[PDB]
Design an enzyme around this catalytic site. Structure first.
Site, PDB file in Angstrom:
ATOM      1  N   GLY A  13       5.998  -9.930   7.566  1.00  0.00           N
ATOM      2  CA  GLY A  13       5.706 -11.115   6.778  1.00  0.00           C
ATOM      3  C   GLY A  13       4.468 -11.856   7.236  1.00  0.00           C
ATOM      4  O   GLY A  13       3.764 -12.458   6.421  1.00  0.00           O
TER       5      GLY A  13
ATOM      6  N   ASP B 287       4.673  -3.977   2.307  1.00  0.00           N
ATOM      7  CA  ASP B 287       4.669  -4.691   1.037  1.00  0.00           C
ATOM      8  C   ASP B 287       4.669  -6.208   1.191  1.00  0.00           C
ATOM      9  O   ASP B 287       5.675  -6.877   0.939  1.00  0.00           O
ATOM     10  CB  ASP B 287       5.869  -4.230   0.203  1.00  0.00           C
TER      11      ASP B 287
END
Ligand SMILES: [K+]
Ligand SMILES: [K+]
Ligand SMILES: [K+]
Ligand SMILES: [Mg+2]
Ligand SMILES: [Mg+2]
Ligand SMILES: [Mg+2]
Ligand SMILES: [Mg+2]
Ligand SMILES: [Mg+2]
Ligand SMILES: [Mg+2]
Ligand SMILES: [Mg+2]
Ligand SMILES: [Mg+2]
Ligand SMILES: [Mg+2]
Ligand SMILES: [Mg+2]
Ligand SMILES: [Mg+2]
Lengths: 53, 190, 75, 50, 467, 128, 110, 232, 160
Positions: E132, E163
């Site tokens: 993150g 992602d």
RNA sequence: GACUAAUUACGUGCCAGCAGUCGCGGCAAUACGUAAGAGACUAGUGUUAAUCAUCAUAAAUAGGUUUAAAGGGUACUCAGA
RNA sequence: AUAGAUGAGUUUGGUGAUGGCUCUGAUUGAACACU
């Protein structure tokens, strides 16, 4: 009617734009006003008696 | 065009850099005219200390002071010295000052307040000449302690240059300083 | 004194843009930079003719216009 | 006060305002100093803050 | 999104800590300190619901002129996300699986906002940055690395796929480095992040407090274009440069860099590994045998499904838009919650803390997957059950608007040669002059001219090897 | 001064200032009638030189004050009922009153053309 | 025309000569100085905290600033050969042009 | 400033009387103040009386004076509006210089500005003499056909005049309910009722009924108005 | 006690006049209330209670103070971060109004009038930049924050 | 005369006189007394007396006390703040 | 009730202060003089 209006304004939620644009003050400082008694007060006094002796 | 037939504005025409016809369209007035004296080895020598304000009427004002043995020559010195000392003076809506200012000059304290439109220049005679010349139209002054003619002009001139800047106060506090009058009327009513 | 306020501006904008920036309004470039620019900047949003000064000074003798004898002379 | 009022930290502010409008009301302000645009985006550092 | 809509969309759900993130406002500067040093400032639901309202709110005012995001501790900036919790929720039926998909919705909503932010966004990478933490900086125009910086995406090791907007980023990077960093999950430390291209500037961690003080002094004009505002900050961040190390050389450069472009250009993992085996085989001309051998050992220790899926989007992410990428990643990640590898890898690594030995992917190895079988396609098909992600705005683009602040890459050197007649030594001075002494420009440009530059016409001219 | 010192009565009235014409200011009267006791000449002080036409008057109250006779030439003598008004001869110590010229027995200047009201002179009536 | 004034002063010993720096702030001119430990940092616009009593540091600081100007002059001249002037006529010389047209206008009519 | 031409006054008169259009619409149509539109009608009515009573008008004087003043013929050839119909009185509260400190990203509106000036103050959106124009202009922002936009405007104004007339009707009808008219041999006594307890809390109240006790006749004070203040 | 607020107001003036970055204040329930008000209004930078020595500047907001028990309550102290902008302090003047010798109280009708530049009672109108803090049952609010809440009470200090 | 809008001539010569304050008058006085003009209010106009304001000039709001009016010779202390 | 807050002359060889006096504004159950 005037009593409810006044009591409603003194207990209204803070404006959103004034909540998202204020530096964060840690809770430990702005809310921990209570001063409790030292939990280790008894051990310190018993240990301080020997030192003074 | 033969306007300056005395050689007085030729030097000033270089510093400020504008035609003499524009120099003569400025609002000038002699505020203070003292009669000072200095005791010397050859007796008393009286001089004429004068203070002249060179105004624009649209936000610019300048204060100049000079002294000489002749009263006429002392006025030309302050005029030329005041036209080259012009500085932009911030004014709210081009009619009044920002908020309130209080300047002290050696025992002379002047308190200037910003009054609403249509209030007029309810001020003293010396302040009126400066406000009328700088471009102000609404003000309420006061001499709190002393009324010295000279310091009165110096303190009130220094007060018009010390107005609180609403934009600097906003960036300093991180908060908007919104003029309610402008939002209400959808613009600035001059 | 009075102030003219067109309904066109009232409908579109609600006066929020007049406070944008730091409260006084979004600043615009100076006049000496604009002349050099080929394309002029977008006009500021406000009421039409909202910068002219109002002549308060020339209203001192307004109460005399209410006199019945002065009003006849003005008609 | 034996010192003097220095304003070296406000040369841009003072100069920028003086070059905002003309002294002859009703004319375009003349071109500003050549240095006004050079240090436009370089404000001075904060001084005198213990 | 209005203040009410945003405030109502990020309600403080029960369990949200009060001081997850610490916000501060100076003059012209708005900061965002991730306050969770115990868990290395690991992003989670509570943390994301406090940043979105602020960023949206600070975008409506002209007072906030510089946004800065940083970590609280001295070891990590944002090390990963709440991967562990997702695994547990995924094992509680469909009701629990949709909660995870909702978490990824919030993250992608924030990342898109940070990428399409209309104000200068700076990120202090003072500490390890993984998972993150890679989504709050890569899309920004200013990514400041330090000595403590540690960049990596250890997501293919847990079965997941990189992602946080990586699909837009990595593809559009010089060479095949982007896929390499994703598949291999390499670890970049310190200045190597600066040379690689992830970071834009490189300052010492001790000079960050003095940088914030300066950023606050900067007061831009309301008529300055977004480009001008970025230019001022770029020139200001370079005033605190202490200089790159004198001994540390470019890690991914020269031979190793050339090897990456020769083994990460195909569209099938089988071909990629086949190429590495050749380099590993003794006597390879490249001279990268040690690197090659080491790389294979790590590629044969990750979920084979993620590799196929990961590489698949590296080729497809080079044409998508930033907005379309996040929307696809949501549906893409939604099918990973139902996958077996993810739920297994996470539980067997982070949760168990490495106990019970190595994880057990549903396909044991790539060899099991027959050649004629494409498992990548299945994920790239959004299902009607999962609603399309609804972003906070409509801004989008194909390539980063202002990603030129970093060290010159191959794209820049190439452009310069196609518009000039510079020499081997005169070309370096051109970039050193345009950037006026940016640390590492002389070394970076020199490396580019050692891989894709040939002495075609002697010292007179320099051309590219591709031709 | 502190708030306590003000409860105790520290704000007293300023010391009174002596009026110009005490005889009139005391009883709040604009003028008083008095019988002339003496008609003499008082001399000015340091800067001024001359001879002022004063008159020792005994007011109705009983006080004996020294008035001043404005104008050129008077018509009063011993035991003349004259009206006394406020005022003061700045350059004459002890003279703090004037005398109305159109008064009971004191006659106004007959050869006065300007400011007759101040000296009690009827209009000449040249044509009328 | 009246004499010129420097658009930027780069002092190497602000402690010694304060009469120059005061005229710069009094005439609205930016300044650069080498502030030592005993020099008032409020005299110059841009401070350079360093040792001013060293002839070896003064040569370094001045050299760096000299190269800055050199690099700046180079860009200006490079932009002037492309028909891109990076500066407009000063106000003083600008006024002369206006007067020139006025005097020239008379010749046209007369 | 220009003056409505003779032909212009008639156009305004015919529109209100014959077509029965609301005064607000006629004012907004020709950009004439409602206070001026109502005056033209009153003055015109008097003309009808003179003509009905065979009285000689001042035609020689009218034609001569009209040629000395600028005029604005309404109708087809309209170049500029006659005057501003949206002038809002500058209230004393709104003239003050107030810089309210608010959040950096706050949407300060006219509604919030009115509350900062005072608690009972209204925004300039409610002080207009023809507030229906704003609503009419909001329809143009929603891409509403101009024809339908004028239809709503007429109905809005027309409906507003009905309310005004109703309030006025009830008022006058409620004021005559308190008056008792008792015809007598010579005169008609009008006994008006009122609450004799509404004398404030200390007897001093502006709207009380009765000659006040404890006041000496002020006839001797300076600038004492002893003239009629209004003609009803 | 109100004497603390007066000492606090006078101290912050001297600290800002001396152009100091940090400022210490005795840790009390009253001082903290006014400090939060100054911070909520945008006058001071940060508030953190600590020992006799100031916390780590780089980690001021991340500084985690230890519990305040009876064993160290005597050494605790409030550390305020002063603010300066444009070569001028943001907390220039802190003139007090309610002194120990007299506690000045204001009503809602008077605060409404003072919040628009009109004198009322023992106070004066507020000009541009000035700010007034009133201590009410809803905490130490600002005069404009107490007007929207329709309250009044003790007037602490006038901030210019 | 200046404060305070509005001028010359003659007579007088620290004389006669004017004056709210500073002041004027000793032989070519813009200040006194005449003449004319000018400035202004007007069935009122001036003067005298008084009151408020001017005056933060007894300062509760709201003062001050080194050198200018004004720190007690001293501090232990009841009352009281 | 939100327009309401103003100065001038005079101490000194001279300057800045301190501090009074006087004028500028309004008024009277007023008196007197000329009308
Ligand atoms: K960190
Ligand atoms: K004198
Ligand atoms: K003694
Ligand atoms: Mg005094
Ligand atoms: Mg005397
Ligand atoms: Mg005469
Ligand atoms: Mg030195
Ligand atoms: Mg005069
Ligand atoms: Mg006389
Ligand atoms: Mg005379
Ligand atoms: Mg009469
Ligand atoms: Mg003593
Ligand atoms: Mg004794
Ligand atoms: Mg002496």
């Amino acid at each position: 009617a005037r009593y409810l209006a006044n009591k409603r304004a003194a207990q209204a939620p803070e404006r959103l734009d004034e909540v998202f644009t204020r530096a964060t003050i840690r809770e430990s400082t702005a809310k921990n006003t209570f001063v409790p008694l030292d939990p280790e007060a008894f051990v310190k006094a018993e240990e301080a008696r020997i030192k003074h002796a | 065009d033969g306007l300056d037939d005395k050689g007085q504005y030729q030097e000033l025409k270089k510093r400020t850099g504008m035609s003499v016809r524009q120099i003569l369209q400025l609002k000038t007035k002699k505020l203070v005219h003292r009669r000072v004296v200095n005791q010397t080895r050859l007796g008393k020598i009286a001089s004429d200390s004068v203070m002249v304000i060179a105004g624009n009427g649209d936000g610019w004002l300048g204060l100049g002071m000079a002294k000489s043995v002749e009263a006429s020559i002392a006025v030309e010195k302050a005029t030329l010295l005041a036209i080259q000392n012009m500085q932009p003076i911030p004014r709210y809506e081009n009619r009044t000052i920002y908020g309130e200012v209080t300047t002290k000059v050696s025992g002379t304290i002047v308190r200037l307040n910003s009054r609403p439109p249509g209030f007029g220049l309810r001020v003293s005679h010396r302040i009126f000449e400066m406000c009328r010349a700088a471009g102000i139209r609404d003000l309420s002054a006061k001499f709190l302690r002393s009324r010295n003619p000279m310091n009165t002009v110096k303190a009130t001139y220094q007060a018009l240059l010390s107005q609180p800047n609403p934009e600097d106060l906003a960036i300093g506090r991180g908060k908007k300083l919104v003029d309610v009058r402008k939002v209400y009327y959808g613009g600035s009513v001059y | 004194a009075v102030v003219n306020m067109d309904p066109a501006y009232m409908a579109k904008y609600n006066g929020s843009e007049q406070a944008a920036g730091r409260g006084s309004g979004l600043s615009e470039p100076p006049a000496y930079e604009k002349t050099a620019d080929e394309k002029p900047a977008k006009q500021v949003i406000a009421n039409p003719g909202r910068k002219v000064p109002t002549p308060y000074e020339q209203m001192t003798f307004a109460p005399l216009e209410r006199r019945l004898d002065i009003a006849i002379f003005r008609a | 006060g034996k010192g003097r009022i220095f304003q070296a930290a406000k040369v841009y502010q003072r100069a920028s305002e003086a070059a905002a409008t003309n002294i002859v009301s009703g004319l375009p302000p003349r071109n500003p100093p050549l240095w006004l645009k050079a240090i436009e985006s370089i404000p001075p550092a904060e001084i005198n803050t213990r | 999104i209005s203040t009410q809509a945003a405030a109502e969309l990020f309600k403080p759900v029960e369990g949200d800590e009060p001081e997850d993130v610490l916000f501060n406002s100076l003059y012209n500067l708005r900061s965002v300190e991730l306050n969770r040093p115990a868990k290395y400032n690991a992003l989670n639901g509570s943390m994301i619901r406090k940043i979105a309202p602020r960023l949206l709110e600070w975008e409506r005012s002209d007072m906030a002129n510089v946004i800065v995001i940083k970590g609280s501790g001295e070891k990590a900036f944002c090390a990963g996300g709440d991967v562990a919790a997702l695994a547990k929720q995924n094992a509680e039926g469909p009701e629990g699986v949709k909660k995870s998909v909702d978490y990824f919705g919030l993250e992608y909503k924030l990342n898109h906002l940070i990428s399409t932010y209309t104000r200068p966004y700076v990120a202090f990478l003072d500490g390890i940055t993984m998972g993150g933490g890679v989504g709050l900086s890569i899309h920004a125009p200013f990514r400041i690395a330090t000595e403590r910086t540690v960049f990596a995406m250890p997501e293919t090791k847990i079965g997941f796929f990189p992602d946080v907007g990586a699909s837009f980023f990595l593809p559009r990077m010089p060479g095949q480095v982007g896929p390499y960093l994703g598949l291999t999950s390499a670890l970049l430390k310190g200045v190597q992040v600066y040379y690689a291209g992830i970071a834009t500037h490189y300052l010492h961690s001790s000079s960050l407090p003095a940088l914030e003080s300066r950023l606050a002094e900067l007061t831009p004009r309301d008529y300055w274009t977004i480009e001008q505002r970025l230019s001022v900050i770029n020139d200001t961040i370079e005033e605190f440069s202490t200089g790159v190390p004198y001994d540390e050389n470019i890690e991914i450069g020269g031979k190793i860099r050339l090897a990456i472009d020769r083994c990460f250009k195909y569209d099938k993992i089988d071909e990629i590994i086949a190429a590495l085996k050749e380099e590993a085989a003794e006597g390879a001309k490249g001279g990268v045998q040690s690197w090659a051998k080491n790389t294979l050992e790590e590629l044969t220790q990750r979920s084979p499904t993620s590799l196929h899926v990961t590489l698949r989007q590296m080729r497809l992410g080079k044409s998508w838009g930033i907005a379309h990428t996040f929307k696809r990643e949501h549906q893409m990640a939604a099918k990973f919650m139902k996958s077996h590898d993810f739920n297994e890898g996470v539980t067997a690594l982070l949760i168990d803390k490495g106990a019970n030995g190595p994880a057990k992917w549903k396909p044991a190895s790539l060899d099991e997957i027959p050649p004629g079988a494409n498992i990548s396609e299945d994920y790239f098909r959004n299902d009607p059950e999962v609603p399309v992600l609804e972003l906070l705005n409509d801004r989008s683009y194909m390539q980063y608007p202002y990603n030129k602040f970093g060290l010159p890459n191959d794209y820049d050197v190439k452009e310069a040669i196609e518009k000039g007649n510079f020499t081997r030594e005169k070309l370096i001075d051109h970039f050193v002059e345009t950037r006026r002494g940016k640390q590492g420009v002389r070394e970076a440009v020199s490396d580019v001219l050692d891989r894709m530059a040939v002495r075609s016409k002697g010292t007179e001219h320099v051309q590219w090897k591709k031709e | 001064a502190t708030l306590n010192q003000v409860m105790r009565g520290c704000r007293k009235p300023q010391r009174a200032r002596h009026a110009v014409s005490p005889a009139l200011s005391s009883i709040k009267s604009p003028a008083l009638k008095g019988v002339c006791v003496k008609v003499g000449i008082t001399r000015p002080k340091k800067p001024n030189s001359g001879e002022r036409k004063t008159a020792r008057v005994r007011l109705s109250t009983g006080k004996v004050i020294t008035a001043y006779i404005p104008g050129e030439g008077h018509n009063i003598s011993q035991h003349s009922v004259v009206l006394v008004r406020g005022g003061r001869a700045q350059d004459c110590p002890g003279v703090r009153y004037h005398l109305v010229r159109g008064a009971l027995d004191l006659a106004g200047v007959a050869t006065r053309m300007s400011s007759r009201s101040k000296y009690g002179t009827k209009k000449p009536k040249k044509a009328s | 025309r009246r004499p010129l004034a420097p658009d930027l002063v780069v002092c190497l010993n602000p402690k010694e000569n304060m009469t120059l720096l005061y005229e710069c702030s009094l005439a609205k001119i930016p300044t650069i100085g080498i502030i030592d430990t005993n020099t008032n940092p409020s005299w110059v616009t841009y401070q350079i905290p360093a040792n001013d009593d060293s002839l070896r540091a003064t040569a370094l600081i001045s050299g760096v600033l000299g190269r800055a100007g050199e690099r700046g002059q180079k860009r200006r001249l490079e932009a002037a050969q492309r028909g891109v002037v990076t500066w407009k006529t000063p106000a003083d010389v600008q006024g002369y042009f206006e007067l020139a047209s006025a005097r020239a206008a008379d010749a046209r009519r007369r | 400033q220009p003056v409505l031409s003779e032909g212009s006054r008639e156009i305004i008169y015919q529109d209100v009387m014959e077509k029965g259009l609301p005064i607000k619409a006629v004012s907004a149509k020709y950009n004439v103040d409602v206070r001026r539109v109502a005056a033209v009608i009153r003055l015109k009515e008097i003309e009808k009386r003179w003509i009905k009573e065979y009285k000689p008008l001042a035609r020689p004087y009218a034609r001569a004076v009209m040629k000395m003043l600028p005029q604005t013929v309404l109708g087809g050839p309209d170049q500029k509006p006659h005057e501003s119909i949206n002038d809002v009185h500058v209230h004393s509260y709104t003239t003050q210089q107030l810089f309210v400190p608010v959040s950096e990203s706050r949407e300060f509106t006219r509604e919030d500005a009115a509350k900062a000036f005072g608690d009972h103050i209204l925004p300039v959106d409610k002080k207009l003499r023809v507030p229906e124009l704003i609503e009419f202009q909001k329809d143009l922002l929603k891409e509403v056909p101009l024809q339908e936009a004028n239809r709503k405007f007429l109905n809005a104004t027309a409906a507003s005049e009905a309310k005004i007339a109703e309030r006025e009707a009830k008022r006058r009808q409620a004021v005559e309910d308190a008056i008792t008219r008792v015809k007598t041999d010579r005169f008609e006594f009008r006994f008006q009722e009122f609450n004799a307890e509404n004398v404030g809390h200390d007897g001093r109240d502006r709207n009380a009924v009765g000659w006040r006790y404890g006041v000496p006749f002020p006839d001797r004070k300076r600038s004492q108005i002893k003239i009629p203040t209004k003609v009803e | 006690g109100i004497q603390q607020i007066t000492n606090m107001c006078s101290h912050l003036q001297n600290a800002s006049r001396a152009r100091l970055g940090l400022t210490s204040l005795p840790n009390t329930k009253y001082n903290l209330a006014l400090a939060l008000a100054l911070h909520r209004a945008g006058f001071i930078s940060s508030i953190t209670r600590g020992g006799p020595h100031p916390p780590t500047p780089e980690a001021l907001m991340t500084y985690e103070p230890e519990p305040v028990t009876s064993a160290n309550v005597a050494t605790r102290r409030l550390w305020v971060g002063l603010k300066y902008w444009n070569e001028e302090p943001v907390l220039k003047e802190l003139k007090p109004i309610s002194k120990p010798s007299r506690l000045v109280t204001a009503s809602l009708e008077q605060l409404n009038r003072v919040a628009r530049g009109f004198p009322a009672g023992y106070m004066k109108g507020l000009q541009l930049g000035e700010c007034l803090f009133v201590n009410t049952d809803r905490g130490v609010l600002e005069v404009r924050e107490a007007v929207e809440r329709k309250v009044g009470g003790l007037v602490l200090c006038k901030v210019k």
